[PDB]
């Protein structure tokens, strides 16, 4: 039987990274994780079974067959940034942080440099999706590389349709009542 990832739709920062990790595992190893939605402002942004702290790590470590490439130590570096730095709605702070990424991506297609993405790419793209301040900074590309990178992953339905799944899900939550 699966885990239950429960994510919250009224949350100020919506846990898109976690939704996207869950969808990857499901894509390769079907029924590994059940996704559950809950519209309610007194509720954590994400919950894996019981754990509320460190949920992304938990998913990522658990299914280590799917999450293997990239030097562990280094995936930690960029998961950190993502979680504690690319969420903040403060243009002065963001810009500095986006620059770090934009330099990292100079001679690269993916963050840690491989031929395919890693957990780092997930943590970051998710963070930037939740923080809607970043929408305008792209869309109109203050940091060229970051805009090129983000645009790529957007084309992958596991990433770029992550939003609809949520919209649809919350629609169904209102039906199942009401």
């Amino acid at each position: 039987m699966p885990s239950t990832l429960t994510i919250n739709g009224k949350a100020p920062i919506v846990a898109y990274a976690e939704l996207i990790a869950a969808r990857i595992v499901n894509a390769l190893a079907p029924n590994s994780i059940a996704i559950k939605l809950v519209d309610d402002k007194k509720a954590p942004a994400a919950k894996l079974d019981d754990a509320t702290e460190d949920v992304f790590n938990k998913i990522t470590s658990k299914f280590a067959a799917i999450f293997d490439n990239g030097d562990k130590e280094q995936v930690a570096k960029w998961v950190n940034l993502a979680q504690k730095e690319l969420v903040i709605k403060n243009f002065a702070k963001l810009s500095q942080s986006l620059e770090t990424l934009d330099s990292q991506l100079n001679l690269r297609t993916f963050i840690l440099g491989g031929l395919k993405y890693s957990a780092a790419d997930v943590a970051c793209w998710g963070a930037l999706r939740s923080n809607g301040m970043c929408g305008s900074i792209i869309k109109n590309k203050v940091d060229v590389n970051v805009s090129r990178w983000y645009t790529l992953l957007e084309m992958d339905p596991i990433f770029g349709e992550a939003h609809d799944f949520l919209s649809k899900s919350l629609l169904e939550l209102k039906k199942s009542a009401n």
Binding site: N106, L107, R108, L115, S147, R148, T151, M155
Partner: protein, 121 residues
């Protein structure tokens, strides 16, 4: 029609599908006629602009054949000019987008010791 077209189709992705917008069709158009004339080199600067915003030549999730045809003619011409560079570290900064594209595809198509390009980081 050549060696690298083979090893691309040895790979899951040729494969498919696309695809193709009115935009994207006309894009891979001008990049094939560029090759027909023989005038790759004097369009490096365009290629670099294209590659600045788009990860692959025709704005696709994975490389298309165009991304290989062009790469075949591009790879030598780039690495030649990295030799003849005086600053290079200009060249690098001047052509960093063609450079990350190369670096991707030369590993995707398993080019030999050879052949392959330095790539510093």
């Amino acid at each position: 029609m050549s060696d690298l077209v083979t090893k691309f189709e040895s790979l899951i992705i040729s494969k498919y599908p696309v695809s193709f917008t009115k935009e994207q069709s006309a894009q891979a158009a001008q990049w094939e006629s560029v090759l027909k004339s023989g005038q790759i080199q004097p369009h490096l600067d365009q290629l670099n602009l294209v590659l600045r915003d788009n990860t692959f030549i025709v704005s696709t999730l994975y490389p298309t054949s165009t991304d290989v045809h062009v790469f075949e003619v591009a790879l030598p011409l780039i690495k030649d000019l990295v030799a003849s560079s005086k600053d290079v570290k200009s060249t690098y900064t001047t052509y960093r987008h063609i450079l990350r594209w190369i670096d991707y595809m030369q590993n995707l198509l398993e080019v030999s010791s050879t052949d392959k390009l330095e790539i510093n980081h």
